[PDB]
Amino acid sequence: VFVSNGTHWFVTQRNFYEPQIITTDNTFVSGNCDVVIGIVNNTVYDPLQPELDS
Amino acid sequence: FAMQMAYRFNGIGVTQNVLYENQKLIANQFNSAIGKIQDSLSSTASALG
């Protein structure tokens, strides 16, 4: 599931809390934000992004 | 509750994007289906055999 403390957004397994920074690789794309009731704005991390500067 | 149904779908091998992309329809489907339970139990005499 997704969760936040109130300042940092995270994803965690559903039966023992362990916050992961929300990377692409924790997640999958669908559609657009018009249809999902209660969706939230954020940034999602791309692990390749710094490697493009390297 | 929608976040629960997104697990219920994930448990039958349906990826949960198919839930939220349909939530208002799935609500209407289930509300209507509960509606038929009144009629099924109320109108039929043999229903509790």
From Swiss-Prot, chain A:
Q: Which residues are glycosylated?
A: N5, N41
In the record, the effect of H8Y is given as:
In strain: Theta/P.3
Effect on the protein of changing D25H:
In strain: Alpha/B.1.1.7
Superkingdom is Viruses
Tell me, in a sentence or two, what this protein's role is: Subunit of the fusion protein that is processed upon entry into the host cell. Mediates fusion of the virion and cellular membranes by functioning as a class I viral fusion protein. Contains a viral fusion peptide that is unmasked after S2 cleavage. This cleavage can occur at the cell membrane by host TMPRSS2 or during endocytosis by host CSTL. In either case, this triggers an extensive and irreversible conformational change that leads to fusion of the viral envelope with the cellular cytoplasmic membrane, releasing viral genomic RNA into the host cell cytoplasm.
Q: What is this protein called?
A: Spike protein S2'
**Which organism's genome codes for this protein?**
Severe acute respiratory syndrome coronavirus 2
Q: Which gene specifies this protein's sequence? A: S
